[PDB]
């Protein structure tokens, strides 16, 4: 399952290294 919240979580992980 992939949705907008998954993308949001990946972007958080990127901003925090």
């Amino acid at each position, epitope marked *: *399952k992939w949705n*907008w919240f998954d993308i*949001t*979580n990946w972007l958080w992980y*990127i*901003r925090k290294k």
Partner: antibody, heavy 132, light 110 residues
Framework: QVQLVQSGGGLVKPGGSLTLSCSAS????????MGWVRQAPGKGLEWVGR??????????EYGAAVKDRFTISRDDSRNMLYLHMRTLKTEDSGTYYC???????????????????????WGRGTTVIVSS | DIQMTQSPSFLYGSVGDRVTITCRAS??????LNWYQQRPGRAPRLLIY???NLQSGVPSRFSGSGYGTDFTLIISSLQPEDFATYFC???????????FGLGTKLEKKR
């Protein structure tokens, strides 16, 4: 088309409890956040709460006016959404709408990890009357 | 607490008119704001999300703008099906006592 068939409700005494039901079809229920909004007679909209996917932890989040007394639950195996209410007050009377919710990631770098959230499809509503 | 103030409470217009509905947030909420339409006897529907994005199926005469505290919903060519109640909704935080504006009812002008 997305269908959100609502049931339950009716008359209940102050201090009583009620569960409202929302039967969903026409979309991938398991992959959707869902929520509830209410409207007292002749008044405006008030957010009741939302629930995430099971893979997100099935977390419920609640509006200020109901947090102590309401629970949202979901049964993905039956495409069912529930609102469990206890210790009802006369001011809990009104129309209760279930909602299929959606989001969009914020793409501004400093806001990576936040999202725009909105109630994308609304059910017809269920009437609750809390009265002695 | 974030307070959303919507104006006017009652807006009067004629078919074909351009009308403007305003919503002001008590603090800066950037573009975390949605607009909903509640037509008589029907459940609400989403019009605009994130301040300016039209939901699919929404007619072109609807637009939203604003960033920060002042937001506007504009209907450029009022249709009979647009005589309805409109609500703004902040999506910046889940904790405010009231996340929706109190509503604007669009009525017929005379």
């Amino acid at each position: 088309q997305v269908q959100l068939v609502q049931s339950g409700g009716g008359l209940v005494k102050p201090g009583g409890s009620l569960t409202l039901s929302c039967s969903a079809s026409g979309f991938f229920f398991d992959n959707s956040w869902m929520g509830w909004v209410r409207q007292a007679p002749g008044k405006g909209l008030e957010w009741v709460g939302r629930i995430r996917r099971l893979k997100d932890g099935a977390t419920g989040e609640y509006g200020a006016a109901v947090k102590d007394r309401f629970t949202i639950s979901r049964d993905d195996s039956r495409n069912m959404l529930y609102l469990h209410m206890r210790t009802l007050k006369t001011e809990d009377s009104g129309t209760y709408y279930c909602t299929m919710d959606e989001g969009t990631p914020v793409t501004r770098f400093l806001e990576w990890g936040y999202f725009y959230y909105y109630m994308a499809v609304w059910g017809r509503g269920t009437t609750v009357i809390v009265s002695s | 607490d974030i307070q959303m103030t919507q104006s006017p409470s009652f807006l009067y217009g004629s078919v074909g008119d351009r009308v403007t509905i305003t919503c002001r947030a008590s603090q800066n909420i950037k573009d975390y704001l949605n607009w909903y339409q509640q037509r008589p006897g029907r459940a609400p529907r989403l019009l605009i999300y994130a301040a300016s994005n039209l939901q699919s199926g929404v007619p072109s005469r609807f637009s939203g703008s604003g960033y920060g505290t002042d937001f506007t919903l504009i209907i450029s060519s009022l249709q009979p099906e647009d005589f309805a109640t409109y609500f703004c909704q902040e999506s910046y935080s889940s904790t405010p006592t009231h996340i929706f504006g109190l509503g604007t009812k669009l009525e017929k002008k005379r």
